[PDB]
Amino acid sequence: YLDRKLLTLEDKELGTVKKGYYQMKKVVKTVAVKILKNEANDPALKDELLAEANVMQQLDNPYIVRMIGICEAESWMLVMEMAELGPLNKYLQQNRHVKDKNIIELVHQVSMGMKYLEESNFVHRDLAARNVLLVTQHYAKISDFGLSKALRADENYYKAQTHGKWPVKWYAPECINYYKFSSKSDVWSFGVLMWEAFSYGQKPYRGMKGSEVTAMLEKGERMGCPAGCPREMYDLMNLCWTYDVENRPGFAAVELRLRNYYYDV
Ligand SMILES: Cn1ncc2cc(Nc3nccc(N(CCCO)c4cccc5[nH]ncc45)n3)ccc21
């Protein structure tokens, strides 16, 4: 737990999200803070942020947002190291001259964070461009672990009871049809994230209902190649969107395909 006296929040909002400065043992660290009311809150939304904190305290990777801690004071606060450029989708909407090599670099960093998550046997379950936060224009981090789950030792998937309120346009068919979430389900989501990144933050499956996306995908249809997208990156999207989970690659295989140097498998 953090000391409220060492935290300063900027009033201008960044639910309530603020930028702040947290005094560490020597230096100040710039932080982003999710703030909830102490009494008139939503207990389920608080449970989700406590669940996020429980996951993020177990993770340690350069391509995943680091948690500073929780502060219990005039409000309930979840404090993270700030990736100040913010969400990747908004960034690419506002910066349309980011070069192909730079977009590949960023999505490669996300694949390295997700290869670590997969090795760690956690599923993310909300992997979208809005949840990739930029430290700089050359350094991406994965965020938003509110739906994340630690997999059981004897299974490679998390089974949800039924469909909740989900980011269905980012979900694999086995998630929608059987409520089963694996690291290969996150690979499907990563394919959608790549499409967003090469479409300068446009929303996927524009104008379609979730049920219409399910029917489209079952028929073997997929979103088309974004204008100007490198062919090799659209081909990797299609491999991420392999319907059968058993033939879809995992993140170790996807991460290799985003490297810009020679390597062996
Ligand atoms: C303009 N804008 N909008 C959102 C946003 C976010 C950041 N950077 C950032 N960096 C680290 C964490 C973080 N937040 C706020 C996300 C708001 O949607 C978090 C706080 C608490 C828990 C969290 N989990 N995942 C992220 C996150 N935000 C910069 C500019 C931004």
CSV table of all heavy atoms in Angstrom, one decimal, residues 190-191 194 231-241 249 253-255 257-258:
chain,number,residue,atom,x,y,z
A,190,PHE,N,-4.7,-10.4,-31.0
A,190,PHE,CA,-3.5,-9.7,-31.5
A,190,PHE,C,-3.6,-9.5,-33.0
A,190,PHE,O,-3.1,-8.5,-33.5
A,190,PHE,CB,-2.2,-10.6,-31.1
A,190,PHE,CG,-0.9,-9.9,-31.6
A,190,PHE,CD1,-0.3,-8.9,-30.9
A,190,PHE,CD2,-0.3,-10.4,-32.7
A,190,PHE,CE1,0.8,-8.3,-31.3
A,190,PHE,CE2,0.9,-9.8,-33.2
A,190,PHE,CZ,1.4,-8.8,-32.4
A,191,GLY,N,-4.1,-10.4,-33.7
A,191,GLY,CA,-4.4,-10.2,-35.2
A,191,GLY,C,-5.3,-9.0,-35.4
A,191,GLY,O,-5.0,-8.2,-36.3
A,194,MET,N,-3.3,-5.9,-34.7
A,194,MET,CA,-2.4,-5.6,-35.9
A,194,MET,C,-3.2,-4.8,-36.9
A,194,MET,O,-2.7,-3.9,-37.5
A,194,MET,CB,-1.8,-6.8,-36.5
A,194,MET,CG,-0.7,-7.5,-35.7
A,194,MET,SD,0.1,-8.9,-36.5
A,194,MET,CE,0.8,-8.0,-38.0
A,231,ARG,N,2.2,-6.4,-47.1
A,231,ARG,CA,1.6,-7.7,-47.4
A,231,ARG,C,1.9,-8.7,-46.3
A,231,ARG,O,1.0,-9.5,-45.9
A,231,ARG,CB,2.0,-8.2,-48.8
A,231,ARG,CG,1.3,-9.5,-49.3
A,231,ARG,CD,-0.2,-9.4,-49.3
A,231,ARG,NE,-0.7,-8.3,-50.1
A,231,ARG,CZ,-1.9,-7.8,-50.0
A,231,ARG,NH1,-2.8,-8.3,-49.2
A,231,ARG,NH2,-2.2,-6.7,-50.8
A,232,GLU,N,3.2,-8.8,-45.9
A,232,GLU,CA,3.6,-9.8,-44.9
A,232,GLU,C,2.9,-9.6,-43.6
A,232,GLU,O,2.6,-10.6,-42.9
A,232,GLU,CB,5.2,-9.6,-44.7
A,232,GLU,CG,5.8,-10.8,-43.9
A,232,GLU,CD,7.3,-11.0,-44.1
A,232,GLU,OE1,7.7,-11.2,-45.2
A,232,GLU,OE2,8.0,-10.9,-43.0
A,233,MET,N,2.5,-8.4,-43.2
A,233,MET,CA,1.8,-8.1,-42.0
A,233,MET,C,0.3,-8.5,-42.1
A,233,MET,O,-0.2,-9.1,-41.2
A,233,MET,CB,2.0,-6.7,-41.6
A,233,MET,CG,3.4,-6.3,-41.3
A,233,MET,SD,4.0,-7.2,-39.8
A,233,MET,CE,5.0,-8.5,-40.5
A,234,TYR,N,-0.3,-8.3,-43.3
A,234,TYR,CA,-1.7,-8.8,-43.5
A,234,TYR,C,-1.7,-10.3,-43.6
A,234,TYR,O,-2.6,-10.9,-43.0
A,234,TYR,CB,-2.2,-8.2,-44.8
A,234,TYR,CG,-3.7,-8.6,-45.0
A,234,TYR,CD1,-4.7,-8.2,-44.1
A,234,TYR,CD2,-4.0,-9.4,-46.1
A,234,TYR,CE1,-6.0,-8.6,-44.3
A,234,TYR,CE2,-5.3,-9.8,-46.2
A,234,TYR,CZ,-6.3,-9.4,-45.4
A,234,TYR,OH,-7.6,-9.9,-45.5
A,235,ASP,N,-0.6,-11.0,-44.1
A,235,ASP,CA,-0.6,-12.4,-44.1
A,235,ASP,C,-0.5,-12.9,-42.7
A,235,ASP,O,-1.1,-14.0,-42.3
A,235,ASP,CB,0.6,-12.9,-45.0
A,235,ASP,CG,0.5,-12.6,-46.4
A,235,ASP,OD1,-0.6,-12.3,-46.9
A,235,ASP,OD2,1.5,-12.7,-47.1
A,236,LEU,N,0.3,-12.3,-41.8
A,236,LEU,CA,0.4,-12.7,-40.4
A,236,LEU,C,-1.0,-12.5,-39.7
A,236,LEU,O,-1.3,-13.3,-38.9
A,236,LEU,CB,1.5,-11.9,-39.7
A,236,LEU,CG,1.7,-12.2,-38.3
A,236,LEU,CD1,2.0,-13.7,-38.0
A,236,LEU,CD2,2.9,-11.4,-37.7
A,237,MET,N,-1.7,-11.4,-40.0
A,237,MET,CA,-3.0,-11.2,-39.4
A,237,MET,C,-3.9,-12.4,-39.8
A,237,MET,O,-4.6,-13.0,-38.9
A,237,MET,CB,-3.7,-10.0,-40.0
A,237,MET,CG,-3.2,-8.7,-39.5
A,237,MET,SD,-3.9,-7.3,-40.5
A,237,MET,CE,-2.5,-6.1,-40.4
A,238,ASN,N,-3.9,-12.9,-41.0
A,238,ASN,CA,-4.7,-14.0,-41.4
A,238,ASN,C,-4.3,-15.3,-40.7
A,238,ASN,O,-5.2,-16.1,-40.4
A,238,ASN,CB,-4.7,-14.2,-42.9
A,238,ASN,CG,-5.8,-13.4,-43.6
A,238,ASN,OD1,-7.0,-13.5,-43.2
A,238,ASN,ND2,-5.5,-12.7,-44.7
A,239,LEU,N,-3.0,-15.5,-40.4
A,239,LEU,CA,-2.6,-16.6,-39.7
A,239,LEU,C,-3.1,-16.5,-38.2
A,239,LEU,O,-3.5,-17.5,-37.6
A,239,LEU,CB,-1.1,-16.8,-39.7
A,239,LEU,CG,-0.5,-18.0,-39.0
A,239,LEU,CD1,-0.9,-19.3,-39.6
A,239,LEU,CD2,1.0,-17.9,-38.9
A,240,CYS,N,-3.1,-15.3,-37.6
A,240,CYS,CA,-3.6,-15.1,-36.3
A,240,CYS,C,-5.1,-15.5,-36.3
A,240,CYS,O,-5.6,-15.9,-35.3
A,240,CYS,CB,-3.4,-13.7,-35.8
A,240,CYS,SG,-1.7,-13.3,-35.4
A,241,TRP,N,-5.8,-15.2,-37.4
A,241,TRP,CA,-7.2,-15.5,-37.5
A,241,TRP,C,-7.5,-16.9,-38.0
A,241,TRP,O,-8.5,-17.1,-38.8
A,241,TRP,CB,-7.9,-14.4,-38.4
A,241,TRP,CG,-7.7,-13.0,-37.9
A,241,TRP,CD1,-7.7,-12.5,-36.6
A,241,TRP,CD2,-7.7,-11.8,-38.7
A,241,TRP,NE1,-7.5,-11.2,-36.6
A,241,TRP,CE2,-7.6,-10.7,-37.9
A,241,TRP,CE3,-7.7,-11.6,-40.1
A,241,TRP,CZ2,-7.5,-9.4,-38.4
A,241,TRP,CZ3,-7.7,-10.4,-40.6
A,241,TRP,CH2,-7.6,-9.3,-39.8
A,249,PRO,N,-1.3,-20.3,-34.5
A,249,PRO,CA,0.0,-20.2,-33.8
A,249,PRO,C,-0.2,-19.7,-32.4
A,249,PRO,O,-1.1,-19.0,-32.1
A,249,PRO,CB,0.8,-19.2,-34.6
A,249,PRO,CG,-0.2,-18.3,-35.3
A,249,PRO,CD,-1.3,-19.3,-35.6
A,253,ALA,N,5.5,-18.4,-31.9
A,253,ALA,CA,5.6,-18.4,-33.3
A,253,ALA,C,5.2,-17.0,-33.9
A,253,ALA,O,5.9,-16.6,-34.8
A,253,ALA,CB,4.6,-19.4,-33.9
A,254,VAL,N,4.3,-16.3,-33.3
A,254,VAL,CA,3.9,-15.0,-33.8
A,254,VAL,C,5.1,-14.0,-33.6
A,254,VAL,O,5.4,-13.2,-34.5
A,254,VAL,CB,2.6,-14.5,-33.2
A,254,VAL,CG1,2.4,-13.0,-33.5
A,254,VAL,CG2,1.4,-15.3,-33.6
A,255,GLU,N,5.7,-14.0,-32.4
A,255,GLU,CA,6.8,-13.1,-32.1
A,255,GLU,C,7.9,-13.2,-33.1
A,255,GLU,O,8.5,-12.2,-33.5
A,255,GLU,CB,7.2,-13.3,-30.7
A,255,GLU,CG,8.3,-12.3,-30.2
A,255,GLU,CD,9.7,-12.8,-30.5
A,255,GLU,OE1,10.0,-14.0,-30.4
A,255,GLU,OE2,10.6,-11.9,-30.9
A,257,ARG,N,7.8,-14.0,-36.2
A,257,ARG,CA,7.4,-13.4,-37.5
A,257,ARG,C,7.4,-11.8,-37.5
A,257,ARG,O,7.1,-11.3,-38.5
A,257,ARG,CB,6.0,-13.9,-37.9
A,257,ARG,CG,6.0,-15.4,-38.2
A,257,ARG,CD,6.3,-15.6,-39.7
A,257,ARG,NE,5.3,-15.1,-40.5
A,257,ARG,CZ,4.2,-15.9,-41.0
A,257,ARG,NH1,4.2,-17.2,-40.6
A,257,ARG,NH2,3.3,-15.4,-41.8
A,258,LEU,N,7.6,-11.2,-36.4
A,258,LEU,CA,7.7,-9.8,-36.3
A,258,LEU,C,9.1,-9.2,-36.1
A,258,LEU,O,9.3,-8.0,-35.9
A,258,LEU,CB,6.7,-9.3,-35.2
A,258,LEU,CG,5.3,-9.4,-35.6
A,258,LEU,CD1,4.4,-9.3,-34.3
A,258,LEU,CD2,4.9,-8.4,-36.6
